[PDB]
Design an enzyme around this catalytic site. Structure first.
Site, PDB file in Angstrom:
ATOM      1  N   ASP B  33     -13.024 -33.255 -13.483  1.00  0.00           N
ATOM      2  CA  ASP B  33     -13.201 -33.489 -12.069  1.00  0.00           C
ATOM      3  C   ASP B  33     -12.238 -32.605 -11.284  1.00  0.00           C
ATOM      4  OD1 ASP B  33     -14.184 -34.647  -9.798  1.00  0.00           O
ATOM      5  OD2 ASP B  33     -13.839 -36.717 -10.487  1.00  0.00           O
ATOM      6  N   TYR B  50     -17.525 -18.776 -11.853  1.00  0.00           N
ATOM      7  CA  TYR B  50     -17.279 -20.213 -11.858  1.00  0.00           C
ATOM      8  C   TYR B  50     -17.517 -20.876 -13.215  1.00  0.00           C
ATOM      9  CZ  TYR B  50     -17.434 -25.084 -10.168  1.00  0.00           C
ATOM     10  OH  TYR B  50     -17.202 -26.427  -9.962  1.00  0.00           O
TER      11      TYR B  50
END
Lengths: 286, 288
Positions: B33, B50
């Site tokens: 997260d 990413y």
């Protein structure tokens, strides 16, 4: 667009309207650490545990409902043959005059959930407790302002859901929807929990089916019964204004220096829920 | 078992892994997260990619967890209680060369759980991804050192459980037991989670059937990818030695002063609550 100081200074009715507007509509609140609290704030030599505890539970439920929260879910229980005693403690929830007056005064419909029909002893007393739960759900059924769900062995709903679903499909011809499953387990449809207020060691329990990533978690340091109005309000403020603050952070629009602060802070270990033990008692650090 | 935090921190890795094998956490839930933030902070959003960065860090962390003797890691990857982009990401988890090489090298048995069959696009691409999940589970089924459960829409198992139970009763003539329900949902029997390590705002999600009051909950301040060896050891130490300290408190046997320190603490600091935070530039941080 309200600050915390402002929220703290609001009249009670304004807080209640805000909570009805933005939630938490469904709040989970087990009363935990009642043991420790009883030894610290009462006289164990003279006072009786069950009555004192019940008084405090009433106070807190009153507070929660008066803050505009519609539904409270409260897990209560999850030597031996001191079971008579603890069945009497459960009995209080359906027979004690002060709490019955509380349900009346605050128009609370009381429901029970969990595996208590099978897990309670097959004694006349066990049957009596179960029957008094049934009867209490019936006699408060005309109340519609608030809902109180008490959990008794309310921890492992899987098997209960399996059997409910088998029966349902047999009598309806298709599986029950999620809403129908929830109605079957709690007695009535209830939304997902908006918050859980726990105590001590970080852990949650006993609200099957109603947990989500949107359930805000809080953990008091002191036992639940020490809960003050200020504290409840700081919790409410956090859940309503801070937990889903908009707009979300825009890292690209942040200065080099802000990014530097974040980068440095995260680079130089801090984790909530890591504790320390003193005299056999765990405390969260930080 | 009379071990201090400094001692535990100074232990060789194999000693820690052996202790974790002995005492848990056997089943650990760990979502990755705060990854957007981590990426903007530790990569060059202008130059770096990413997904590769994120996958690299997830691998690093899963590797660390398994190397600390944890049997099963449960990792919610995409959560719909918290498509859009990634049917793609899960594809990466079943198809990327590096991660496959990881499952092999660390002998990981991989499982997928959740409502992905129904939530994934009903395209040939969706079907292909589902098949690749199945194939990966079969392919790594001989791996026995560790188990990795990936959550793909793994929230709200109620309807899945209802359908599984209906079918089961149809074939067996009786309801499935809890154990059987778990096997149905995860593919294999998995024990209840011993710990959940989250990030930021205190909340947990996406490990249906496996939560209990005995699941120790932790919440890091930094995004998951900042997880270091020392942090992980502090968490492990707390869970193994502190969360279930023995003997449990006997208040009637406590001295006047033992009671007094507690009473005084609670009366003199009456409003202490973990989980109440503050927001700055849209970022929530826990106080305390």
């Amino acid at each position: 667009l309200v600050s915390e100081k402002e929220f703290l200074d609001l009249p009670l009715v304004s807080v209640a309207e805000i909570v009805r507007c933005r939630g938490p509509k469904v709040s989970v609140f087990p009363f935990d650490g009642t043991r420790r609290w009883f030894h610290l704030e009462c006289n164990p030599q003279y006072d009786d545990y069950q009555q004192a505890a019940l008084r405090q539970s009433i106070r807190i439920l009153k507070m929660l409902f008066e803050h505009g929260i519609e539904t409270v879910i409260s897990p209560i229980f999850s030597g031996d043959r001191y079971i008579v005693q603890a069945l009497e403690g459960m009995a209080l929830l359906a027979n004690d005059e002060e709490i019955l007056s509380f349900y009346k005064e605050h128009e609370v419909h009381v429901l029970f959930y969990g595996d208590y029909k099978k897990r309670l002893p097959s004694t006349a007393q066990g049957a009596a407790v179960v029957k008094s739960f049934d009867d209490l759900t019936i006699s408060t059924s005309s109340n519609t302002e608030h809902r109180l769900c008490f959990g008794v062995f309310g921890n492992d709903a899987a098997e209960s859901v399996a059997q409910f679903s088998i029966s349902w499909n047999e009598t309806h011809g298709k599986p029950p929807t999620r809403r129908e499953i929830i109605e079957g387990y709690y007695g009535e449809y209830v939304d997902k929990a908006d918050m859980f207020i726990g105590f001590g060691r970080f852990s949650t329990f006993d609200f099957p089916l109603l947990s989500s990533g949107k359930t805000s978690l809080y953990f008091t340091v002191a036992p639940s019964y020490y809960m003050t109005e200020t504290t409840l309000r700081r919790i409410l403020y956090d859940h309503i204004y801070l937990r889903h603050f908009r707009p979300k952070p825009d890292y690209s629009a942040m200065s080099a220096d802000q990014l530097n602060v974040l980068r440095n802070r995260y680079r130089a270990d801090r984790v909530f829920g890591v504790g320390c033990v003193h005299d056999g008692i765990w405390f969260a650090e930080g």
